Ligand binder design. Structure first.
Ligand code: GDP
Lengths: 64, 171, 69
């Protein structure tokens, strides 16, 4: 009769701890994504500031 | 020799991004915060001799990148909460945002409230006093600022970074 | 059966959570893909502008270097 609860709880332990594991990896996944997206933006920015300073350079040659 | 990962959050049109660009001393207005809702900037500073790299994520709360923006909350060492003193619900919400920080971010993270646009007193709706009480209740630091006039931006970051470092040199 | 009455609840719940966490794998790269794609577009639109206003700006440093020389 009680056997159903007996299983249910054994089942809760397994799911509780698989859940813990699963979270350690969400943590990594996120650090990696940060580091990657970080550098993505870094570049996008660097690359834009080049195109603009290029325009500025011959902007000033033209006012002189 | 140190790398601090920082995050700026709060309601939209609070000034979060100008706050950033000011501190990052970028000579341009050019951002992706409008058309993406994320932006990123670095600055290294000296704190008691040492070189400190600061990595500042600016998020804008769009569900389009909910999962990614958590990655920023989860990995952030210091997170500035920003409201606009010209606007109440920005301030009212500062609790809501604290819920998130508490809920999405780490347990010991360093926090700081930044009542923004202080420079414009004529349209002020949120008293400074009321702002420092908010802060003291939650037991975190508070600081009024102005991205445009350049008031206390730099002091805010240096301040936050000192709190971070001091916490780390303890361990 | 008071214990089970509610024991089954966290089991449902814990489980429901595990499910959500596994999704977290692909939900990251899914977003990443989009974000990357976007930057590409947006940063381009940017560089496009700079180029048009640089290049048009270039041909009058020959036209005005030609109005002098
Ligand atoms: N008076 C004043 N206006 C500001 C200040 N900071 C930002 N703004 C203006 O507020 C508007 C939106 O700010 P924004 O940085 O986009 O807020 P974000 O969306 O949270 O980044 C723009 O018109 C900014 O120029 C400030 O410190 N003082």
């Amino acid at each position: 009769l009680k056997e159903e609860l007996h299983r249910a709880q054994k089942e809760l332990k397994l799911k509780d701890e698989e859940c813990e594991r699963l979270s350690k990896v969400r943590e990594q996944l996120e650090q990696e994504l940060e580091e990657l997206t970080a550098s993505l933006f870094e570049e996008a920015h660097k690359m834009v500031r080049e195109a603009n300073m290029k325009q500025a350079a011959s902007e000033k040659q033209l006012k002189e | 020799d140190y790398l601090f990962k920082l995050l700026l959050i709060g309601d939209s049109g609070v000034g979060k991004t100008c706050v950033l660009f000011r501190f990052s001393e970028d000579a341009f207005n050019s951002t992706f915060i409008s058309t993406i809702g994320i932006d990123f900037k670095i600055r290294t500073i000296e704190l008691d001799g040492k070189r400190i790299k600061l990595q500042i994520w600016d998020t804008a709360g769009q569900e389009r990148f909910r999962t990614i923006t958590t990655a920023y909350y989860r990995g952030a060492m210091g997170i500035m909460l920003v409201y606009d003193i010209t606007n109440e619900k920005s301030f009212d919400n500062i609790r809501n945002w604290i819920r998130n920080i508490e809920e999405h971010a780490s347990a010991d993270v360093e926090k700081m409230i930044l009542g923004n646009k202080c420079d414009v007193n004529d349209k002020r709706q949120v008293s400074k006093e009321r702002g420092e009480k908010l802060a003291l209740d939650y037991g975190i630091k508070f600081m009024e600022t102005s991205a445009k006039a350049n008031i206390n931006v730099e002091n805010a970051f240096f301040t936050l970074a000192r709190d971070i470092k001091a916490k780390m040199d303890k361990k």
